[PDB]
Amino acid sequence: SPVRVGLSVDASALGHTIPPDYTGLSYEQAQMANPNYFSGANTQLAGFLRTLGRQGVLRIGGNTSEYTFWNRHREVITPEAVNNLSEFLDKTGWKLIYGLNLGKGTPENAADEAAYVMETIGADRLLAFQLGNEPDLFYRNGIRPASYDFAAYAGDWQRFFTAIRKRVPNAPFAGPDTAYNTKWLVPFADKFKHDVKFISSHYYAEGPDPSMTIERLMKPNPRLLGETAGLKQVEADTGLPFRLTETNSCYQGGKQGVSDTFAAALWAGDLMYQQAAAGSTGINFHGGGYGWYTPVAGTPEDGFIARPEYYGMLLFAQAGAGQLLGAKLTDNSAAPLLTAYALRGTDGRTRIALFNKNLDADVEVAISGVASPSGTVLRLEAPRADDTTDVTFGGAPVGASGSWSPLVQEYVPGHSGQFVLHMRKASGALLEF
Numbered sequence: 001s002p003v004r005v006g007l008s009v010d011a012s013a014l015g016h017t018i019p020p021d022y023t024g025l026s027y028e029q030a031q032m033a034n035p036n037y038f039s040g041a042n043t044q045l046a047g048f049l050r051t052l053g054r055q056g057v058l059r060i061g062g063n064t065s066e067y068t069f070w071n072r073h074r075e076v077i078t079p080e081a082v083n084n085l086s087e088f089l090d091k092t093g094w095k096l097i098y099g100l101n102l103g104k105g106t107p108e109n110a111a112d113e114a115a116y117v118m119e120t121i122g123a124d125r126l127l128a129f130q131l132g133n134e135p136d137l138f139y140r141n142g143i144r145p146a147s148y149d150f151a152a153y154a155g156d157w158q159r160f161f162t163a164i165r166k167r168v169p170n171a172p173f174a175g176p177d178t179a180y181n182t183k184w185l186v187p188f189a190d191k192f193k194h195d196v197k198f199i200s201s202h203y204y205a206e207g208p209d210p211s212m213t214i215e216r217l218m219k220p221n222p223r224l225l226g227e228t229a230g231l232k233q234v235e236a237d238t239g240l241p242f243r244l245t246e247t248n249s250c251y252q253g254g255k256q257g258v259s260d261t262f263a264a265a266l267w268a269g270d271l272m273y274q275q276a277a278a279g280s281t282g283i284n285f286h287g288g289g290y291g292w293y294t295p296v297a298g299t300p301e302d303g304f305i306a307r308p309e310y311y312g313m314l315l316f317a318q319a320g321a322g323q324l325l326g327a328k329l330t331d332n333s334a335a336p337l338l339t340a341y342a343l344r345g346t347d348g349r350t351r352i353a354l355f356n357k358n359l360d361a362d363v364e365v366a367i368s369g370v371a372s373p374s375g376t377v378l379r380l381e382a383p384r385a386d387d388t389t390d391v392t393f394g395g396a397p398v399g400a401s402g403s404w405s406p407l408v409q410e411y412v413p414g415h416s417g418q419f420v421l422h423m424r425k426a427s428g429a430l431l432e433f
């Protein structure tokens, strides 16, 4: 007995165009201690990335980038590791955001590392260097003293920028690689707008706010809306686009029973669209090893698997790129966590991404504004919102090496230019007209 809601696709309410390199993952720089990880020999992980997008961005940084030390002969990055990363990026078709050690390393070491990266990976595949991860939190791990402020950071950033550009005159940069805030990200954009390609921000649905639950994770985040508005103002005031270079559901590798659940797939897929509709250039979900929130879990020795969050990213992958249209929801007060995104695809077909994040309400969606004859739906499903497994998209799990294709396509009940789509509570759908 579903909530009956109306969705009006207005193909004339033009939103932002989703770039083809929108999707991405964030990893710890420490993973590069192991040259077998980001390697042309790591076909399994390479396969998982190709499935998330023919283009995308691998971001390497995180808290371990303050403890990772480049050497041409505490974790150590070797020329072998950088050489193997170039071969990895060749197998995936993805571009690279590469963190440099501004926390504990020297300008001269960062310049040397940046030179070897540009020499091996090249200007086409290297999107940006980043000078430190979350510099606003250096003072909390003692990487800097408590007195460290934006002024001190700007001094450090300039010293590193100068040293790297002497070795790498075409070196591209992004920063400041943390959450939107007025004490760091606004002044950074103002001072360094001529020295960076784009602004890099982070976002965790968990706050410092009450404890994170599946219930909480499905609701709007006023902090997210605030931070996104901040980044749009910085883009208006400076011309700098923004990318969400580190994101996931909960901090410290995630929360067992939230981050590792089917709920995370609905949250992650919806987030991708909410940020793309705000004009974000892209996203990088943080992950690695077996962390609770990792899209892809595993190791080269034991192999890799898609975790539930991966399936939300997979729905985005299958929607593909294009321009977002108006998709207005009515009669939805009793089903308020249903979200919907309409997309004019690059191939000229209309697509709708629906996230029924209501944990108790089934919906009946009356779709108008699509003058196409017919549509098919691929469902994003698990039997409970807190399932750690049993997740499918298009009636299939993702297999070894990111192997996926749909096994259940279901024609959409259509008649007189109106379509009716049923969705279970805590489910997602991709409609292709």
Ligand SMILES: *[C@@H]1[C@H](O)[C@@H](O)[C@H](OCCNC(C)=O)[C@@H](C(=O)O)[C@H]1O
Binding pocket: 028, 061, 062, 063, 064, 133, 134, 202, 246, 250, 251, 252, 253, 254, 286, 287, 288, 289, 291
């Ligand atoms: C952003 C940080 O830059 C990340 O280092 C940090 O990840 C920590 C756990 N690592 C993994 C691979 O699971 C992340 C977080 O707190 O989860 C953010 O603080």
